[PDB]
Every structure is written in C-alpha cells, then in structure tokens.
C-alpha cells in the first residue's frame, strides 16, 4: 500500500505534529494507547499509510520527532497521545539552537543529522511502497529552518524519486516572534526552492484572523491554530487513506499544481469554518463551501490572492458529494473570477472527492492554490533581509558558526530570482 513517513522538527513542527496525530488517530479510531476501537472497517483498509502495526493490535505511527533540545519533545511524552509514538523515534539533542539557521544546519544539528537518518531509514524499509516524506517546521526558527533543510537535502540525495511535502509556517507580515527571522527565512527558502517538490505556506497572522472573525473564538491558543493546520494536512492525504469517486494522491496534486519546478510554494485553505453561533444559520452544501474556500478571508497565508493571479488550484472534497455540483461550482468560479487565473493555462482547477468526511462533519473541502501573489511574501522577506544585511545587523552570530558572508548574498540572489520568475508568468501572451 502507499505509505508516508512523517518528520517534525523544532517546537513548531513537533507541536503541530502532536495535534496532527490526534486528528489522524481519531479518524481511524485508535485509542491513545495505540489500540484500535473504531466502528467502521474502512478505517483499517489503509491504516498502513501512517501506522505500523505492532503485536496485539497496537498501531504505532511512523513519525520521526527531531528537536535539538529535549524541552518540547518532553511535553509530547506527557501529552494525551504521548504513549503512541515509538520511544526510539524521539531523536532529541541537548544544546538547542539559538534561533540561528547556522547552528541548526552546520554546527549542532550536523552532529545529530546522522542519528535521525538511522530512524528514518528503518521506517522507509518498513514500508512496502514508500510514496514520500512530510516535514513540519517553521521557517523563522533555528532548529526547524536549520535542521529541516539539512534533513531535506540529505534525504533528497537518498530518495530522489520519492516526494517530500513541507508544511512550513512562514513569518507573518506585521507581527514577528523572532528578531532574526529574515536571515533564517531567506537561507531556508534557498534550500527549499530546489530540494522540495511542494510546500504549504502557513502564517500565524492569517490563522489568528480566521479564529477572530471566521470562527468567533475569543481566546485562541496554539491548541486551536494547530487544529486548522492539521485539518488541512489531513485533507491533502485523504485519498490515500480512504476511497472516493475521484482520487488524488500526493503525486497527483504535485504534477497538476506545479507548472514550473521552482514555483512550488502554495497557500492552503479549509472549509467549512463556522462559529457555533452562526452554525445554525448556514446551510451545508457544495455551493456554500466553494465560495468560502476561494474567499481571500479564509486563506491561511497573509498574501491577498486578489493582488495576483492563480496558476493552478486544487480543491479536495470529502464526505458524501454530488459531482455535478462540484463541477458546476468550479465552473462558476472559473468564469466569475475571470481575471484571477493566468490565461496561458486553459483550466486551473484540479478536483478530487473522498467518500469519508472528517470528524463529525458531513462534508468538507481543502483548498490548495499556487497563486503568484505569494511573490509578495518573498518580496517582503528580501526587503527585510537587505535592511539588516546592508550593515551586518546580526551577521556575527552566523559567521561564528562556520557560515561565510558569501552564502548570504548567494541566498539573497537566489531569492531575488524566484520573485523575478514569479513576476514573469504574471504577464499574459496577449
């Protein structure tokens, strides 16, 4: 069967993974101890996708949890679903990265890179037909950006044919969490822009907005944001886990979504998102879901899609569906928003439908869009990068870890090319 191995690096990656496996395990009816207590036989039909079956019906997820400091991973052990992961997969270091890409990529993480590969290789061999790898991390952090890219380069060299998805949290436009994010992001993107096949950019600012207005949640915590990220993460892999009328695995999404190899940065979305107050007043039908997913107010990226054009779009539905409604609504969006798609691609929507809905919902959809508006995100990071690097604001920390200043300009130049390439295709033949 098709199989995936999950990698989570850093505080952001590990905490997202913890919520992600809570959602995945709940759908397949897995007890926190690892036992199976589901009701439908269709859950075990593809449980091999994520879980290795151990003796006694104890299903063990094949996830590799990496963090240069024990702190974050220690809480995962004591969490509600801590006792499901294999103890040996917790590859934790001691000296945590100081939020600098250099330490997590060259000095400290380089010592732990070999240990992680040992766990991953065992998982890859445990599979019968491995499809691809998944990485959850943040581009603004040290370990995630550093260790994540170091892992990506190494595994790519060892699994060139397979796929690797990257659910990466991206720095927010207005409010930042770390001072030196521009250096980490620019360097990290320089690695992802050539080593990963698809990326799912997410930013906390957009997720905060969704909770504030789209969900009317007064006190949102990371126990809430990570659920939306997990929900989108589960949607992308639903076809692998469950049957449907029109399926789309990870490879199918990548081929349709990526026109050119370097333009593989996407922006996800989810529907339906309704507050309990407004739940009663809204009808749950395909037409309603289509409007929300294409609404700029629901995108999980700060960049407003209306400021640019769509190269490719993918909507993965779940639950009982009507194919005619799906096609009609996609036809409406294609025509109504005439100028939001590049003409040189006659049709931009790749659809997929799964029979099983998520959790208690009777219907859901996950949105993926390869908009050119994301060029704005890279534009801002480069502007911030040049603002600091112009006079070496924080460069002595990176140079002291073995990095050379020539690398920063190479990353800057490579990043500038990506924006130029994006701008080129925003033009039209006529």
């Amino acid at each position: 069967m098709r199989e995936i191995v999950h990698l989570q690096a850093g505080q952001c990656g590990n905490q997202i993974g913890a919520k992600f496996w809570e959602v995945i395990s709940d759908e397949h009816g897995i007890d926190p101890t690892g036992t199976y207590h589901g009701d439908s036989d269709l859950q075990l039909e593809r449980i091999n996708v994520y879980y290795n079956e151990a003796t006694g019906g104890k299903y063990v997820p094949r996830a590799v949890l990496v963090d240069l400091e024990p702190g974050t991973m220690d809480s995962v052990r004591s969490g509600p679903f801590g006792q499901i992961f294999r103890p040996d997969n917790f590859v934790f270091g001691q000296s945590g990265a100081g939020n600098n890409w250099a330490k997590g990529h060259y000095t400290e993480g380089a010592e732990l890179v070999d240990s992680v590969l040992d766990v991953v290789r065992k998982e890859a061999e445990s599979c019968d037909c491995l499809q691809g790898f998944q990485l959850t991390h943040s581009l603004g952090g040290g370990t995630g950006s550093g260790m994540g890219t170091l892992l990506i380069s190494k595994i790519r060299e060892e699994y060139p044919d397979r796929i690797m998805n990257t659910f990466s949290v991206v720095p927010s436009p207005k409010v930042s969490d770390t001072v030196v994010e521009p250096y980490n992001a620019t360097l990290s993107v320089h690695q992802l822009v050539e080593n990963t096949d698809e990326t799912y950019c997410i930013d906390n600012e957009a997720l905060y907005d969704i909770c504030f207005r789209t969900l009317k949640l007064t006190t949102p915590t990371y126990g809430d944001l990570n659920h939306l990220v997990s929900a989108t993460m589960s949607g992308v892999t639903t076809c692998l886990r469950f049957p449907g009328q029109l399926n789309a695995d990870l490879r199918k999404l990548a081929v349709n979504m990526v026109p050119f190899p370097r333009l593989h940065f996407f922006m996800p979305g989810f529907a339906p998102l309704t507050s309990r107050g407004s739940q009663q007043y809204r009808a749950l039908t395909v037409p309603e879901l289509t409007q929300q997913m294409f609404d700029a107010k629901n995108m999980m990226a700060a960049c407003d899609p209306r400021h640019g054009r769509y190269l490719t779009v993918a909507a993965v539905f779940r639950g009982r569906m009507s194919m005619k409604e799906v096609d009609e609504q996609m036809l409406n969006v294609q025509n109504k928003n005439s100028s939001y798609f590049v003409e040189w691609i006659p049709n931009n929507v790749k659809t997929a439908v799964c029979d099983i809905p998520p959790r208690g919902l009777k219907m859901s959809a996950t949105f993926i869009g390869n908009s050119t508006a994301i060029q704005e995100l890279f534009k801002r990071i480069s502007e911030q990068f040049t603002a600091m690097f112009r006079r070496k604001a924080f460069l002595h920390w990176y140079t002291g870890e073995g990095m050379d200043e020539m690398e920063f300009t190479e990353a800057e130049s490579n990043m500038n090319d990506l924006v130029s390439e994006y701008q080129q295709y925003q033009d039209a033949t006529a």
């Binding site: 098709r2 037909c129 006659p346």
Partner: protein, 431 residues
Amino acid sequence: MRECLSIHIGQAGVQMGNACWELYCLEHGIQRDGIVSDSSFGTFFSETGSGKHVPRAVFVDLEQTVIGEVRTGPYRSLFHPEQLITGKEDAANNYARGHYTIGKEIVDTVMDRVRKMADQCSGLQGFLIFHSFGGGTGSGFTSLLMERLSVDYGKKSKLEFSVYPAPQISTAVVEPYNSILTTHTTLEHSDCAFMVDNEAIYDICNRNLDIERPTYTNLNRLIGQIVSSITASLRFDGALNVDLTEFQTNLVPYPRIHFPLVTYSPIISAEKAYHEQLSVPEITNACFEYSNQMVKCDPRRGKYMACCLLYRGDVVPKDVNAAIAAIKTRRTIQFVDWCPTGFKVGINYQPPTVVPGGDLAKVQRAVCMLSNTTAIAEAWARLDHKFDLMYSKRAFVHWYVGEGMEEGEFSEAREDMAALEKDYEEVGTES
C-alpha cells in the same frame, strides 16, 4: 458470434466496468455471487465447469484504491482474482508515467492474462477497452495495451469507450497534454472509439432525467446501457443482427476517422414516463437532437458521415424504415454528399432491463445511435487550442520529460493531431 473481451483501465474505466458488469449479470440473470440462478451469455462469460460464470474481463490499474473496492465489494466472488491486476503507485495524471516508467513494469502481467483469456475462446470478435481520455493510467497505459494488442491480434476488432474531456468542465490541469498524447498513439491502432463527455451526460441527467443530485454512479450506470445496446446483437437474437465487426466496416469511411459519438433514447424518469407514448418515431427523433447526444459538440454545426441505429425491444421493422425515411428528408439534418447511404439499421428482440434503484424508467422500446459526424472536429480543435496555449511556455513539460520521454514527442503529437483536424475538413467538402 463468440467472445468479445473487455479491458477496463483506470479509475474511470473500472468504475464504468462495475456498472457495465452489474448490467450484464442482471440481463442474463447471473446472481452477484456468480451463480446462474441460456446459450448466449458465453460472449462475455466463461462457465467454470461448476455453474459459476466468470466475466471475460481484465481490470487493470496502477493504484490499488479502485480495484480494492471491487475486491471488497459485492462482486468480489464474481471476478477471477488474477484478472484484477493492480499496481503499486498511481500514474499521478502523468501520461509519461503511465506509458514509460510505471506502465512498462505491469504491461507484461496484463498481456499474460489477455492471452489466457483469448485462448479459451472458439471465436474472438474483438476487445472492448474502457478508459478515460484524460488521465495518467487511463490514457498512458491504454496506449501501451493498444500497441501490444495490435502486434499480437492484428485485424481483430479493438473497440474503445473513451471519456473525452468536456469542453467546459475539467477535473485536471494537464488533460490537454494527456488527451492529445494518447490520441497520437491510438489513432493508428484503434479501430473505432465511442466518445462520451461528462458534461454532456450531466446535462441529460438534469433535463431529461429529473435527478438534481447525479453522481458518477449515475453517469456510469447510464453509460453502461450504451455498451449493452452495442453488444446486444452478439448476446441476443433478432432481425438485422449487427455483429461487432460491422461497426468498423460501416462507421469508419477512412482509417483515421473512427470517433463516433454516443446517443441513447429514451432517457426519461418514472413519473415523466406516464405522459409519453414512446413510439418508434418518438424515440428515434430524439436521437438526432442536440439535447440528447452524449458529447457536448453540437451535431447541427456539422454533417454526418454514418449512423447505426441499434433498435431494441418491441419494435417493428416497418416503423424503423418510415422513421428513418422521415429523418433523411429533413433539410436541417445534413448528410455528406459522398455517402448517399448513411444509416446502418439494427434490431434486437430483448428489451432493455431495469436496474433496481436506478433513475431510468422501464421502457419496452429503446434505441441507441452511433454516429460519425464532422461536428466532432469542434472538440479536437478546442483540445488543440488548449495544448499549444500551454506548450508555448512549457507549462508542465518538465514532469513528462523526467519520466523517460523526449520533448520532440510533444511536437509530433500535435502535428499528427493537426493533420486529423485537416482530414475532417477534407471529408466535409464536396464539389
């Protein structure tokens, strides 16, 4: 009249196959467990020396998901387990994968089954191939089978049912590449292809049928009736029997023009049936209207080159001649000058059966039309326009190239497609 072999490739073809075979079993009365609770079901079934009948089909896919449903479905006992061939990794909507890289690995396994199926036939009329024109496995692997079948079974009928990309609705971004590439590799090998569009059938379900929530279980179930009408002559007796090879002899004037479109009448709901006589002229006149054809291309925009009206049920030959005579005198309906005779009548006694839980009403009289019209050129042109619009900028060529395919193949494919468009222009004009 003896066996015709059905090969169902891809998610579209397989999902159509289970609808078709569900229809075949009910017509002959074979239960869902393969037991036969008389002499004509041998065309599509093999008697397993025990009262259990195995369908003469090969179900091939590069992903276990679709065939896994059949293995666990109600018809699990029906199919020979070795026939349900499945791959490891899907073609990912990539023609190159389905043809070169992952297709080459599983092609031999399929041919091994086909040869064993063929050997147990006293007579082999030909092959039915169900596939989607747009898609990785349904378009890349079928090209392999067409090439493999042709060398082994030259001059044997190779019919195919293809889901042509709808002019307006689309469910994948790289269909123009996949659809044009498969056309190039099947034009020389295939005998004729019956074209159906999902958008066209959706329109019928809303207007003719009263179903406001159609699903692929409805399209495939309706599409299954098309194949039943085509193969009824083999499986049943009646005046003017139409064998399988008569289609290629009648509906294909030139080797490269073998893409008849599909039409079926009547298609009416149970409630709306009470208010209609449904006489031979009533059903017959419907087949030639734009509102009922299963390809969204408008027939009135072009001219016909051949038609085969496969009448079925309690029908009278005289009424067929009278109804056909009325059609030919219409000025709006135009037949190309160089074909004075366009109709290929065919009548069968077995009426269409009613699928329980279906959206189609019980009709004691039905007609199915296969027509080769130049108006289908309006469908190829849109595919051609959608191709060069992307290939000029190399929209997705890197995915195809990396899978062991050369860029020059793209140029050759369109050049062959361009000539096909020219051919329809040449045949459509007379002094």
